[PDB]
Symmetry: D2
Subunit: 317 residues, 4 copies
């Protein structure tokens, strides 16, 4: 029996007897995602080229304005904005949203896959809302996921009930539920990172990579895949299994990806799917942030693959 994202979320929200605010949040977010998808696939591009005589900016505006007008949020943190955005009192709800409106858009000139990442916290304190309300560890997440604008558009939504995948049918502008209660493979056959930085690798990374090319137990070498867009690489990791790494290097001694709106949502999706996500020293979701734009190293994916990396890492202290 068919189901849509909005209907699925309403049915779960009613079972839980919530106020409805989270459903309003998510529905508004979905409206923003469908709007971004339409622009990313270049609907209307003919008008820009004169038929009748920016993209990361528009995506950010779409998310900001739909979340503000949902009456469900109070603090908004985006990759695009230096400081947290405080929702005006007459539109304030109880939820905090950290998002990357068009992740990977730096290389969008080659039509690489792009996406939107989001993580949702409930505001905890009785104080007036402020940037400090976004400085929660990932354990505190209420919901997280991403929209992938790849060969098709897909929304992956992780909540405490698990992970579910919804395909955008653009003929009717509806997210169709296509993969329920998704679990990642225990172990995969693909590893994913920028090997251009081989010169800067920690020794633990270098050894782990050598095990994938020259397997010590006589198994077959892993394949290598690296789109260079986090949402595409993570979603392949979810679908086919395997492991994704953005460890520390010389240009990025704390890694390059951002903790609040890149690492935490993907880590949350992995763990709800039976996967893992580590910085090397701890779980990503346990990192207590002190800066909304702070960076974090990330290694995630199938549990056997991450655990193997952690064994190698532990060997190097």
């Amino acid at each position: 029996d068919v189901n849509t994202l909005t209907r699925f979320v309403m049915e779960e929200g009613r079972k839980a007897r919530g106020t409805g605010e989270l459903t309003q949040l998510l529905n508004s977010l979905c409206t923003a995602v469908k709007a971004i998808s339409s622009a990313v696939r270049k609907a209307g591009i003919a008008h820009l080229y004169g038929i009748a005589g920016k993209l990361d900016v528009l995506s950010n505006d779409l998310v900001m304005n739909m979340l503000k007008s949902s009456f469900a949020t109070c603090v908004l943190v985006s990759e695009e904005d230096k400081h947290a955005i405080i929702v005006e009192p007459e539109k304030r709800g109880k939820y905090v949203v950290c998002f990357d409106p068009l992740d990977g858009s730096s290389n969008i000139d080659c039509l690489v896959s792009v996406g939107t990442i989001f993580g949702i916290y409930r505001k905890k304190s009785t104080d007036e809302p402020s940037e400090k309300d976004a400085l929660q560890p990932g354990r505190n997440l209420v919901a997280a996921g991403y929209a992938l604008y790849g060969s098709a558009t897909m929304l992956v939504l992780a909540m405490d009930c698990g992970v579910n995948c919804f395909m955008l049918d653009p003929a009717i502008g509806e997210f169709i539920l296509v993969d329920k209660d998704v679990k990642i493979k225990k172990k995969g056959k693909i590893y994913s990172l920028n090997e251009g930085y081989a010169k800067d690798f920690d020794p633990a990374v270098t050894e782990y990579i050598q095990r994938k090319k020259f397997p010590p137990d006589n198994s077959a070498p892993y394949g290598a895949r690296y789109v260079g867009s986090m949402v595409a690489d993570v979603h392949r990791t979810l679908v086919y299994g395997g492991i994704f790494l953005y460890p520390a290097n010389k240009k990025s001694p704390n890694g390059k990806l951002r903790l609040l709106y890149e690492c935490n949502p993907m880590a949350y999706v992995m763990e709800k799917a039976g996967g893992m996500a580590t910085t090397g020293k701890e779980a990503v979701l346990d990192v207590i942030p002190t800066d909304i734009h702070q960076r974090a190293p990330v290694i995630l994916g199938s549990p056997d693959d991450v655990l193997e990396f952690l064994k190698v890492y532990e060997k190097h202290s």
Copy 2:
């Protein structure tokens, strides 16, 4: 002044005073591509999941390309990645062109929504014999037109002909390919290398040396970045747009590479060379290989000319 793919092609064809057959070819090809794009983006998927109470995409794409080319009255021999033998067009629909295509390259991993694409190469039938598979056994040098459609974050048709390379963006609101990049030229040297390094234990020694030169530059230069989508159209297109180098080389286990010459290597080599880039097997230009089997494989290394030349120096250094 705005321009669309069809009109751009009509204006060039009229200037050249051709019969119109090639324009009819290209127009039918674009229609199948618009149909492929719509299925790839999962238009109508709600019906598969029971909203009202079916072929895999590579099968449907092959049917779309096949049926539009046959019904274009411009073709006589069609080679597809999907079919063991060439298709001979029925006499009442026969035109003068030979088309080799890959209808949905990269679709094996479309379950993760990776970029996919369509690759095509167009030849003039040269012999006066009855049309046959032998008419597709032409070297890449003989191509009249070649290109690809990339179904990525957006859909783009790249069309290379003797006049150069032009890029057309599909506006899905109106189903028209909008001309957005005219007479495109690749960077002389790039900063990205692209290949499956998981198989490093099987690398040819020249591939091992060249890749290490990229990671640990001997001249104190900055190392290159690495990108490998695993879908040829996406990787080659990034190579065209940002410059750099793409490798699917031969090794001991794969002495002739993995990619297919007629409808993967030749069309991309033609696009590269028209953009001021290069494309080599290691031993020669890809477009100079004289094929003997429509599904034969070929090693390919392509991209910015300085990068390809650097590879070829290393390849020669290993005798």
Copy 3:
């Protein structure tokens, strides 16, 4: 501040502190309507004509299956089905829905406007669901409206709070609120009926129309419009004012249009917009039905116009 149908209905539903079932129903119907629109605009027709080598039934299937799977309905009455459709026990909700899935589709070969008409009732008794639960007078309506597949696609939704109009943005599949709390003109300048059947007119109908063409005073005659598709004609009546008639005559003493899923929803929209809708003998919404497919004469529109018709109608009674 932008608003969509889903967001608008959730917000009223929260103010009203309801269980959420009605919001679930309407969201499901909305999805069916987007699906009908896509098929009506002939998306994918290329495949029907061989590029790779019914419409009213499909629309009926879309509505039936979306409503059944909403867990909000228990009895479904459609123009397309001889008997009421009883929702299976494990999916039964509290609402009764009467609809015409593709009204006007008889002339769809000429690309005429078509539409979907719906009316929603609360099941009143605790008995086992049966056709009898749909035999409520239009006065009992919880919500009613229509979707018009015209030059664009619009959903007109009438409830106790008034009538609101939503434009389908097909680029993102969202119904945008574009006209809030709409009211009909007190008096209009357009009359609408099939004059080809003039020889069968009731004598009061003949006189009233003659007064529209040959006003006994010094005013200008009314204009005439008749699309032949009820959703199209009633929506024009709502937007521009005026009067729409499908009256009774000697050969059709009860009219031809159907009460449960054409006359009552349109009469309800009219009354919530400050209009009127009469059979000649009483308000349409006061008719107590005895058969789910029963017919009812209907005259509706701007109140001064409807009241003028009743004046002429009394003279011949």
Copy 4:
């Protein structure tokens, strides 16, 4: 075997061994029509209502004007939206003259009534410098004419010397698919179409003819009545279902209401190529020699038997 509009026109163009200029015109027009369709169906309206924080008839006119100019096929363009004819700049001049109504019926688009685009295409006949006079040709001189109907779906009807062909816009791929080949209208229909709101102004022939439709003197069944009020919608129904369409003169419109250059002549061309008729009462619409690009004309068109029946009544009243 499937066929599209562009493919259908090229194949006929190759057979005719013409230069390609008309094919270039028509392809450009079809591109503007798809852009109009997308706008008319309100794609992107969410942005106009603030999702991120031109009137339709003006936009449509811009789309046709700019696509035809850039086609290198036209020299004089006449539009319902512009007071004077537009002369194409010299470096873009081709041989064709185009009269069009970019969004006919848009006056009542607030109620989502069907709207449409009407076009008629002429070869420039005079060798003088291009000017407004190059559009003052009788409809008999048309090379191509037709319309796009933005109704429940979008359909393009194309009439040429070879006959009338109907193409359905599949919005999933932005392609016009051939769905009705070489269309012929019914010899006689059962629907008449006109604004009876002007009954007090009808001349006696119109009054008698309508009375014959409601009270048939042969005791046959009355015709049904339909009047959308949008010309493209009413004419298309007439073409598909047969019957008769009327917009006669009245007191507000002593020379008729509909426009000769880009409403009456193109529909008259489509009707006659479909085996129908289209008359002013005094002569065939296509025989009227215009003197002013926006001049009006009375029109009665549709199935041949129905028009011929009207003309007998017209003859009876002298």
